[PDB]
Amino acid sequence: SLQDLSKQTEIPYGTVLDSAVYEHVRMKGLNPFERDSMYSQMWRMINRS
Amino acid sequence: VADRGYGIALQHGSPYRDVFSQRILELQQNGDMDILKHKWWPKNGQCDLYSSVDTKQKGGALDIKSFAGVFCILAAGIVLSCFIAMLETWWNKRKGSR
Numbered sequence: 599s600l601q602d603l604s605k606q607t608e609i610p611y612g613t614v615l616d617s618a619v620y621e622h623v624r625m626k627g628l629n630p631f632e633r634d635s636m637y638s639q640m641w642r643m644i645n646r647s
Numbered sequence: 648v649a650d651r652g653y654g655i656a657l658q659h660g661s662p663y664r665d666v667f668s669q670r671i672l673e674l675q676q677n678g679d680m681d682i683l684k685h686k687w688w689p690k691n692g693q694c695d696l697y698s699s700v701d702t703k704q705k706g707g708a709l710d711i712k713s714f715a716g717v718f719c720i721l722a723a724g725i726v727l728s729c730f731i732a733m734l735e736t737w738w739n740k741r742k743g744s745r
Contacts, residue, residue: 605700607698630685630688630689635697638690638695639695639698
């Protein structure tokens with residue numbers, strides 16, 4: 599499932615930049631309203647450099 | 648487990664209570680409250696506040712720290728054997744034969 603995969607730490611993960619997937623996860627990341635730590639952890643895995 | 652809320656408290660019979668509650672509700676609707684909220688709890692902190700995955704032992708290996716207490720069992724024997732051996736010089740003064 600997405601929850602463990604987003605909350606494990608051994609496997610790095612990401613996508614193609616400038617994709618709708620990237621833009622969607624960035625939208626869920628940058629927004630301070632967004633609730634589940636899922637989205638912040640996904641962004642923090644992405645936002646490495 | 649939220650339910651309760653933080654509030655501003657007044658003396659009984661203060662008329663201003665209603666004005667305060669009105670203006671607070673207006674600020675909540677008008678979005679200004681969200682700006683002051685974000686200002687002091689900015690999302691993009693130094694580190695993840697929530698992950699405890701945070702593990703030290705991974706390789707499962709024994710090492711010169713975890714095992715090393717056993718070496719004091721050897722050291723006790725070394726010391727005691729040294730101490731006992733030196734009693735040659737104590738007894739052989741008058742042992743009757745060496």
